[PDB]
Amino acid sequence: HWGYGKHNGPEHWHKDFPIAKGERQSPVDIDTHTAKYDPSLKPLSVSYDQATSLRILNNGHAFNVEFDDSQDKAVLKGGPLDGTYRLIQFHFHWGSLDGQGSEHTVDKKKYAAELHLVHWNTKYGDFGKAVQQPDGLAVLGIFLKVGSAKPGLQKVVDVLDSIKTKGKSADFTNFDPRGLLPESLDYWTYPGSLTHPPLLECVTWIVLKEPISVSSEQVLKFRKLNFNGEGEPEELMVDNWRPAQPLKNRQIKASFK
Ligand SMILES: [Zn+2]
């Protein structure tokens, strides 16, 4: 039902998912001049050396690069987090043109795209249990701008032709997500939600300050994907982002001065 089309997009989601108007919805605008440096926050610990990617899937709203999360391999720890969060998948949000695509914004600036690396809290045993808890997920968000190519993205780019339509997947082993990080891991953090239905309020957001650069050719391949299934009317997979939601009673904390 829900999507990013002309009649089922973010402004409609609240009908079926009333949590869309909840108290800790994502994404949000990050006001750089009211996010406060928090000296109690720690450097992120991104431990991806043993990551095992398995598969890439077009799910009709993005594509997910899926990992083996059946044991502690690729984990996120530290930062604002207590305990250990296992990497399950990453995906992107992007626009029809370079001036929109990100979910989070920075002083109202929209980036061309945003990468989400999704991790679940091992204290809850499985992902399905984790999403029912306020500290169940940690999502590392990384902005993309268009300029130079990102070498470590090309292997993703080049498989997209094989998963054009919803429900298609392809083997995708030995991909190293470290090639998608910027140089600095300085970040903002706040409590929020998943950004598409069911919009569960289970996420500690960790949004990196420094964007990565990808090329116009790389982004153009993203924009050739389809929301639709094989043989159905073609709807390009573009503008798969939810706009910023009210901050309400939340504070955005910065890891950096
Ligand atoms: Zn996302």
From Swiss-Prot:
Regulation of catalytic or functional activity: Activated by X-ray, histamine, L-adrenaline, L- and D-phenylalanine, L- and D-histidine, L-His-OMe and beta-Ala-His (carnosine).
The UniProt record lists the keyword Coiled coil: no
Cofactor, how bound (note): Zinc. Can also use cobalt(II) with lower efficiency, but not copper(II), nickel(II) and manganese(II).
EC top class named in words: lyase
Residues annotated as binding Zn(2+): 91, 93, 116
PTM sites of type Phosphoserine: 162, 169
Tagged with keyword NAD: no
Site entry (Fine-tunes the proton-transfer properties of H-64), positions: 4, 59, 64
CDD domains to which the protein is assigned, alphabetical: alpha_CA_I_II_III_XIII
Active-site residues (renumbered): 61 (proton donor/acceptor)
Effect of residue 91 to Y: In OPTB3; partial loss of activity
Enzyme Commission number(s) from the entry: 4.2.1.1, 4.2.1.69
Recorded GO MF terms: arylesterase activity; carbonate dehydratase activity; cyanamide hydratase activity; zinc ion binding
Effect of residue 195 to S/V: Reduced activity
Pfam families, A to Z: Carb_anhydrase (PF00194)
UniProt-reported outcome of changing residue 139 to F/Y: Strongly impaired activity
Effect recorded for residue 59 to V: Reduced activity
Gene Ontology CC, one term: myelin sheath
Effect recorded for residue 118 to K/R: Strongly reduced CO(2) hydrase and p-nitrophenyl acetate esterase activities
UniProt domain Alpha-carbonic anhydrase: residue ranges: 1-256
Extra remark beyond the main annotation: Target of drugs used in treatments against glaucoma disorder and breast cancer.
UniProt name for this protein: Carbonic anhydrase 2
Organism lineage: Eukaryota, Metazoa, Chordata, Craniata, Vertebrata
